[PDB]
Amino acid sequence: ALAAALAQAL
């Protein structure tokens, strides 16, 4: 969840 979120957003 978090890994994907950050990878995408940033």
mmCIF entry with sequence, helices, sheets and N, C-alpha, C, O atoms, coordinates in Angstrom:
data_MODEL
# 
_entry.id   MODEL 
# 
_entity.id                         1 
_entity.type                       polymer 
_entity.pdbx_number_of_molecules   1 
# 
_entity_poly.entity_id                      1 
_entity_poly.type                           'polypeptide(L)' 
_entity_poly.nstd_linkage                   no 
_entity_poly.nstd_monomer                   no 
_entity_poly.pdbx_seq_one_letter_code       ALAAALAQAL 
_entity_poly.pdbx_seq_one_letter_code_can   ALAAALAQAL 
_entity_poly.pdbx_strand_id                 A 
# 
loop_
_entity_poly_seq.entity_id 
_entity_poly_seq.num 
_entity_poly_seq.mon_id 
_entity_poly_seq.hetero 
1 1  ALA n 
1 2  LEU n 
1 3  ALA n 
1 4  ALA n 
1 5  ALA n 
1 6  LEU n 
1 7  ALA n 
1 8  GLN n 
1 9  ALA n 
1 10 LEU n 
# 
_struct_asym.id          A 
_struct_asym.entity_id   1 
# 
_struct_conf.conf_type_id            HELX_P 
_struct_conf.id                      HELX_P1 
_struct_conf.pdbx_PDB_helix_id       AA1 
_struct_conf.beg_label_comp_id       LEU 
_struct_conf.beg_label_asym_id       A 
_struct_conf.beg_label_seq_id        2 
_struct_conf.pdbx_beg_PDB_ins_code   ? 
_struct_conf.end_label_comp_id       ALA 
_struct_conf.end_label_asym_id       A 
_struct_conf.end_label_seq_id        9 
_struct_conf.pdbx_end_PDB_ins_code   ? 
_struct_conf.beg_auth_comp_id        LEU 
_struct_conf.beg_auth_asym_id        A 
_struct_conf.beg_auth_seq_id         2 
_struct_conf.end_auth_comp_id        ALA 
_struct_conf.end_auth_asym_id        A 
_struct_conf.end_auth_seq_id         9 
_struct_conf.pdbx_PDB_helix_class    1 
_struct_conf.details                 ? 
_struct_conf.pdbx_PDB_helix_length   8 
# 
_struct_conf_type.id          HELX_P 
_struct_conf_type.criteria    ? 
_struct_conf_type.reference   ? 
# 
loop_
_atom_site.group_PDB 
_atom_site.id 
_atom_site.type_symbol 
_atom_site.label_atom_id 
_atom_site.label_alt_id 
_atom_site.label_comp_id 
_atom_site.label_asym_id 
_atom_site.label_entity_id 
_atom_site.label_seq_id 
_atom_site.pdbx_PDB_ins_code 
_atom_site.Cartn_x 
_atom_site.Cartn_y 
_atom_site.Cartn_z 
_atom_site.occupancy 
_atom_site.B_iso_or_equiv 
_atom_site.pdbx_formal_charge 
_atom_site.auth_seq_id 
_atom_site.auth_comp_id 
_atom_site.auth_asym_id 
_atom_site.auth_atom_id 
_atom_site.pdbx_PDB_model_num 
ATOM 1  N N  . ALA A 1 1  ? 0.786 -1.216 0.000  1.00 0.00 ? 1  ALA A N  1 
ATOM 2  C CA . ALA A 1 1  ? 0.000 0.000  0.000  1.00 0.00 ? 1  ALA A CA 1 
ATOM 3  C C  . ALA A 1 1  ? 0.836 1.293  0.000  1.00 0.00 ? 1  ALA A C  1 
ATOM 4  O O  . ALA A 1 1  ? 0.691 2.156  -0.866 1.00 0.00 ? 1  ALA A O  1 
ATOM 5  N N  . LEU A 1 2  ? 1.708 1.386  0.999  1.00 0.00 ? 2  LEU A N  1 
ATOM 6  C CA . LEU A 1 2  ? 2.548 2.568  1.170  1.00 0.00 ? 2  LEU A CA 1 
ATOM 7  C C  . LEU A 1 2  ? 3.621 2.670  0.098  1.00 0.00 ? 2  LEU A C  1 
ATOM 8  O O  . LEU A 1 2  ? 3.791 3.727  -0.510 1.00 0.00 ? 2  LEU A O  1 
ATOM 9  N N  . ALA A 1 3  ? 4.348 1.581  -0.141 1.00 0.00 ? 3  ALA A N  1 
ATOM 10 C CA . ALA A 1 3  ? 5.346 1.542  -1.175 1.00 0.00 ? 3  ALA A CA 1 
ATOM 11 C C  . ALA A 1 3  ? 4.855 2.105  -2.531 1.00 0.00 ? 3  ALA A C  1 
ATOM 12 O O  . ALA A 1 3  ? 5.506 2.933  -3.168 1.00 0.00 ? 3  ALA A O  1 
ATOM 13 N N  . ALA A 1 4  ? 3.683 1.609  -2.924 1.00 0.00 ? 4  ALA A N  1 
ATOM 14 C CA . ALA A 1 4  ? 3.046 2.011  -4.181 1.00 0.00 ? 4  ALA A CA 1 
ATOM 15 C C  . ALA A 1 4  ? 2.676 3.486  -4.134 1.00 0.00 ? 4  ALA A C  1 
ATOM 16 O O  . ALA A 1 4  ? 2.985 4.243  -5.054 1.00 0.00 ? 4  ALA A O  1 
ATOM 17 N N  . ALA A 1 5  ? 2.013 3.885  -3.058 1.00 0.00 ? 5  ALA A N  1 
ATOM 18 C CA . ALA A 1 5  ? 1.620 5.259  -2.872 1.00 0.00 ? 5  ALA A CA 1 
ATOM 19 C C  . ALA A 1 5  ? 2.773 6.258  -3.087 1.00 0.00 ? 5  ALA A C  1 
ATOM 20 O O  . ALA A 1 5  ? 2.656 7.224  -3.840 1.00 0.00 ? 5  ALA A O  1 
ATOM 21 N N  . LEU A 1 6  ? 3.882 5.984  -2.398 1.00 0.00 ? 6  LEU A N  1 
ATOM 22 C CA . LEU A 1 6  ? 5.030 6.880  -2.455 1.00 0.00 ? 6  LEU A CA 1 
ATOM 23 C C  . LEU A 1 6  ? 5.712 6.823  -3.812 1.00 0.00 ? 6  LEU A C  1 
ATOM 24 O O  . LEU A 1 6  ? 6.057 7.859  -4.380 1.00 0.00 ? 6  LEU A O  1 
ATOM 25 N N  . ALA A 1 7  ? 5.907 5.616  -4.332 1.00 0.00 ? 7  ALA A N  1 
ATOM 26 C CA . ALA A 1 7  ? 6.513 5.432  -5.633 1.00 0.00 ? 7  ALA A CA 1 
ATOM 27 C C  . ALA A 1 7  ? 5.801 6.231  -6.739 1.00 0.00 ? 7  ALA A C  1 
ATOM 28 O O  . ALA A 1 7  ? 6.427 6.830  -7.613 1.00 0.00 ? 7  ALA A O  1 
ATOM 29 N N  . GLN A 1 8  ? 4.477 6.209  -6.656 1.00 0.00 ? 8  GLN A N  1 
ATOM 30 C CA . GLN A 1 8  ? 3.617 6.878  -7.633 1.00 0.00 ? 8  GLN A CA 1 
ATOM 31 C C  . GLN A 1 8  ? 3.643 8.401  -7.392 1.00 0.00 ? 8  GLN A C  1 
ATOM 32 O O  . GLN A 1 8  ? 4.037 9.169  -8.270 1.00 0.00 ? 8  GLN A O  1 
ATOM 33 N N  . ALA A 1 9  ? 3.224 8.816  -6.208 1.00 0.00 ? 9  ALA A N  1 
ATOM 34 C CA . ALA A 1 9  ? 3.139 10.221 -5.865 1.00 0.00 ? 9  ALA A CA 1 
ATOM 35 C C  . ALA A 1 9  ? 4.397 11.081 -6.083 1.00 0.00 ? 9  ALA A C  1 
ATOM 36 O O  . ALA A 1 9  ? 4.321 12.250 -6.462 1.00 0.00 ? 9  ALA A O  1 
ATOM 37 N N  . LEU A 1 10 ? 5.539 10.461 -5.830 1.00 0.00 ? 10 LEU A N  1 
ATOM 38 C CA . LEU A 1 10 ? 6.801 11.188 -5.840 1.00 0.00 ? 10 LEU A CA 1 
ATOM 39 C C  . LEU A 1 10 ? 7.524 10.995 -7.169 1.00 0.00 ? 10 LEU A C  1 
ATOM 40 O O  . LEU A 1 10 ? 8.613 11.535 -7.364 1.00 0.00 ? 10 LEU A O  1 
# 
